[PDB]
């Protein structure tokens, strides 16, 4: 479940969850804490070099949108809010602090983002289904969170399904319509050769190239696209999500050079 006991909390604090930056960051919540009412996603990020933990399709949409922005430097998901601070805020605001079976819970903000330049050098985001904004308890918890970041002087915003760009939405539908395929060492080994092909065919349409690649190497119909699709869904390949994937040119795809730490 998503609720923690006093020992579970203390234990997570010990392993330093919520601490670190970039590749050293460890999220407070993991896909193991995904609510039974949703779907989780584990996705690789070129910006952080980490495999992130997203607990809903909505969080996935926000993550992909953030990873697309050139100015984003770090993305820290499931960022924990200091209990002593939220404890005091609840008291001052007249709100019952989040608690499960008598155990005060550690609150978390879905994303804490750091940017290299631009309008906001740092901002926080809480993701919520729009319908949830009509729920009184949801609103109370959002107020606690709002006050927390206001206290820290860090801009905080709420993002709902209604803020997802329409093209981004259709791309996620296609990319994640079904259960994300597991990335084998064989599939991971395709990043390098695929990167070279996409590099020279930079000016050509990605779907055409995938098909021409199947014809060339006499591969099974739709083989190359299926590989690209799996690597993209897992994050090893990112593209211009604001444009239908089928409309992306090969130069729009960014392929990461990764080493399967299985050997070394």
């Amino acid at each position: 479940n998503s609720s923690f006991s006093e020992v579970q909390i203390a234990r997570r604090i010990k392993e330093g969850r919520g601490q670190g930056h970039g590749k050293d960051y460890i999220p407070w919540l993991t896909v193991q804490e995904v609510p039974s009412s949703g779907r989780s996603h584990r996705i690789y990020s070129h910006k952080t070099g980490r495999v992130h933990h997203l607990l809903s399709d909505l969080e996935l949409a926000v993550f992909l949108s953030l990873e697309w922005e050139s100015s984003v430097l770090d993305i820290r998901e499931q960022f924990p809010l200091l209990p002593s601070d939220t404890r005091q805020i609840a008291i001052d605001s007249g709100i019952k602090h989040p608690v499960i079976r008598g155990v005060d819970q550690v609150m978390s903000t879905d994303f804490l983002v750091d940017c290299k330049d631009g309008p906001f050098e740092q901002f926080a985001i809480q993701v919520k289904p729009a319908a949830a904004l009509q729920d009184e308890r949801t609103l109370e918890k959002l107020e606690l969170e709002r006050r927390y970041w206001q206290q820290k002087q860090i801009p905080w915003f709420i993002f709902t399904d209604k803020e997802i760009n329409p093209v981004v939405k259709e791309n996620i539908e296609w990319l994640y319509s079904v259960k994300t395929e597991e990335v084998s060492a064989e599939l991971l080994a395709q990043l390098s050769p695929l990167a070279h092909i996409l590099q020279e065919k930079g000016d050509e349409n990605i779907i055409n190239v995938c098909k021409q690649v199947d014809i060339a190497y006499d591969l099974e119909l739709g083989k190359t696209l299926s590989e690209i699709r799996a690597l993209t869904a897992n994050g090893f390949i990112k593209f211009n999500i604001y444009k239908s994937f089928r409309a992306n040119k090969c130069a729009d795809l960014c392929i990461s050079q990764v080493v399967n730490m299985e050997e070394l």
Partner: protein, 49 residues
């Protein structure tokens, strides 16, 4: 010091989400209200155009 019940949310500060909810236009959603105030924003607004 006492936990404010929904019926008294109309007495909270202007920027308190609970107060905003209490004074909202019932024919509209909370989403619409918060987006109008800039509490809810789309990705574009947070990055260089």
């Amino acid at each position: 010091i006492k936990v404010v019940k929904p019926s008294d949310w109309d007495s909270l500060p202007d920027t308190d989400l609970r107060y905003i909810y209490s004074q909202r236009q019932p024919e509209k959603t909370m989403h619409e209200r918060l987006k109008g105030k800039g509490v809810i924003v789309d990705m574009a607004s947070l990055f260089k155009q």
